[PDB]
Every structure is written in C-alpha cells, then in structure tokens.
C-alpha cells in the first residue's frame, strides 16, 4: 500500500523556522512530482509548490517563493518542506502529496505560539 | 491566477438524496495539449484530502460510480446520485491546467 508519512506536529515560537518531512512508501518519489499544500480552517487550501526529485527542479506559488523551500532526497525516498520566519498565519496543517495530488499524507500540524 | 468558484458552499442533505456541486473557473481549463486538468478532492472530517475525479470525468481507484464528473471549458459539475455516510465532508475542485495550482473554497456536505 502506498503511504505518505509526514513528521509529527510542530509547536514553535514566532520567528523560528521548521523543517517538515514526508517519507514515501510504496513508490519512488523520483517517478512523481512531490507537492506541498497548506490548509487553514477558514482560508482553505493553498498550493505551496512542487519538486521533481529526479533533478531537484522546484516551482512555487508566488505567495510562497519567499517563505517555503522544498527539497527532496531520493536515497531516503523523502521530500522536505522548510519554512522561514513563521508568523501567526503560518499556523496551518501542511500536506505533502504525490503527482497530481493523487494521494496525500496525514498532514503535519504547525502551531506558531 | 485562475480563480475557482464553487457553489454552493454548504450542502445539508438527507441520506439517500442526490447532490450537485458547481465549479467555475476564471479562465478555460482546456490546456493547449488538448486535455482539461480539472479535478475533484474529497476531505472527510478529520481526514486528509483525497482525489476523486481527474480529467473532468475520470474516477480514481476505489471511487464509487455514484459520483459523476462533467463539464467543459470553465463550467464543471460534480453530481452524487445518492449521498451516503462515506460521502460526507468537504469537496474541493482544483485545476492543474495553469500554474499555480488553485483550489475552490470547498463545499461542505453534511446531514
């Protein structure tokens, strides 16, 4: 069974920087595009960006070109999401997903206290 | 960016009744390559989102055929022939024709 296992919830202070991970099981991430999506209870879903683990090419939604950094490691079959300068708004559930948002991870809940 | 407008926003219905959700985009989702990359997600309460429909009408694996996707260009519709307990949650349409990928604000289906 294909699984997208994301790291545990992060509770952090305003101004810090977290790094979320997404370990894929049942497929090779280099055969797909790895996506990251942010969700807030009111504002909804927002596409953060996408990475090609085969070469490292990334594409970001302009709203996050500054904030997020998406990396991948094919050896551990894991994709990563790095977030800088977290503010109160960055409080959200962050999802990773394989190509075309076919399957999603359980999401990592970030809280900026 | 492509703005995805879903109507209605909330849908309170009786078990067994049909349902219909509209999804409108600000520009045509027919790609130059000849395919229309409009998709549908379902996110059950407490659950993570999951893709139900891709390429307007294609059902993903495991998705009941009670669901039917239709439409073209900028006007798309998701219909449920009969709402079950497993169909409750939030439905999101989203496009992958133009980047950045954008989502509709979601339609909450409940009883």
């Amino acid at each position: 069974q294909v699984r997208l296992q994301q790291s545990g919830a992060e509770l952090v202070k305003p101004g810090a920087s977290v790094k979320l991970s997404c370990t894929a099981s049942g497929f090779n991430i280099k055969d797909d595009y790895m996506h990251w999506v942010k969700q807030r209870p009111e504002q909804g879903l927002e596409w953060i960006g996408r990475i090609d683990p085969a070469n490292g090419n990334t594409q970001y939604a302009p709203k996050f070109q500054d904030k997020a950094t998406i990396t991948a490691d094919t050896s551990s079959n894991t994709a990563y999401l790095q977030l800088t300068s977290l503010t109160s708004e960055d409080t959200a559930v962050y999802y990773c997903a394989r190509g075309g948002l076919l399957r999603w991870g359980q999401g990592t809940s970030v809280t900026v206290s | 960016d492509v703005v995805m407008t879903q109507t209605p926003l909330t849908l309170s219905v009786t078990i067994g009744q049909p349902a219909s959700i509209s999804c409108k985009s600000s520009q045509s989702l027919l790609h130059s390559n000849g395919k229309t990359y409009l998709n549908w997600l379902l996110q059950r309460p407490g659950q993570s989102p999951k893709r139900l429909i891709y390429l307007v009408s294609k059902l993903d694996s495991g998705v009941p055929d009670r669901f039917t996707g239709s439409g073209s260009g900028t006007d798309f519709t998701l219909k449920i022939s009969s709402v079950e307990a497993e169909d409750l949650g939030v439905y999101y349409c989203w496009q992958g024709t133009h980047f950045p990928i954008t989502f509709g604000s979601g339609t909450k289906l409940e009883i």
Binding site: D31, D32, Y33, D52, R98, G99, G100, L101, L102 | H31, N33, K35, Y37, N39, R51, Y54, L55, K58, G96, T97, H98, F99, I101
Partner: peptide, 8 residues
C-alpha cells in the same frame, strides 16, 4: 504520467 494525469 509523472503528475498522474492531475496537472499539465
């Protein structure tokens, strides 16, 4: 089909 038919 790297995007699994979900996007261009």
């Amino acid at each position: 089909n790297k995007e699994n038919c979900g996007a261009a």
